[PDB]
Symmetry: C3
Subunit: 29 residues, 3 copies
């Protein structure tokens, strides 16, 4: 459970970065 939490937190971080990038490129183009 400790390590499953840690991996969820890593995926959240990666997902959020992917959002941040979509968010940016919708802002542009």
């Amino acid at each position: 459970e400790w390590e499953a939490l840690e991996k969820k937190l890593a995926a959240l971080e990666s997902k959020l970065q992917a959002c941040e990038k979509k968010l940016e490129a919708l802002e542009h183009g």
Copy 2:
């Protein structure tokens, strides 16, 4: 602290999910 943090991770995950759904909507108008 454990289930508090788990609850806090669950809330972020669904807020992020909302964000990704609203970004995709914005994408299509």
Copy 3:
């Protein structure tokens, strides 16, 4: 490590709040 996990969760939540505020500005002008 617990305190490191919590700081990472705090930072994720700040970036999410920031992505949410940017998304509202894009939705609504």
